């Protein structure tokens, strides 16, 4: 009982508040997210796979803000500060991740449970 390797958890829905970090006048996190990583404009007639949008963290400023909040490499961010990113645009998303009204972005993300352990899994 308790944890069974080989069985997909599909998507762990967890909330994580990741806060931008001090770089002088800059408050920023320094991790990277892909909204488009493996896609194109041509899917939007369907939104990729319906409401997909293809938003997924592809890196992290390690030992920094995101990951300490509870973020890691390979995470699908669905919303920030409670703002469903799926129906909104990447620039719109950019706005509410890094404006001057927060100090932190509260995320609705989807975990695989396969956190940082450097697993080289690459399939094209």
């Amino acid at each position: 009982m308790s944890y069974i390797p080989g069985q997909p958890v599909t998507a762990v829905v967890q909330r994580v508040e990741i806060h931008k970090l001090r770089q002088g006048e800059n408050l920023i996190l320094g991790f990277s997210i892909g909204g488009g990583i493996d896609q194109d404009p041509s899917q939007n007639p369907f939104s990729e796979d319906k409401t997909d949008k293809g938003i997924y963290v592809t890196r992290v400023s390690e030992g920094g803000p995101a990951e300490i909040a509870g973020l890691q490499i390979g995470d699908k961010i669905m919303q920030v500060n409670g703002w469903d990113m799926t129906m909104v645009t990447h620039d719109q998303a950019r706005k509410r991740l890094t404006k001057r009204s927060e100090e932190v972005v509260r995320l609705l993300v989807t975990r695989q449970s396969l956190q940082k352990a450097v697993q080289q899994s690459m399939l094209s």
Binding site: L29, G30, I33, G35, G36, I37, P41, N44, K53, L97
Partner: peptide, 8 residues
């Protein structure tokens, strides 16, 4: 929708 990534 399309390929665009960003650090923040």
């Amino acid at each position: 929708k399309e390929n665009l990534e960003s650090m923040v």
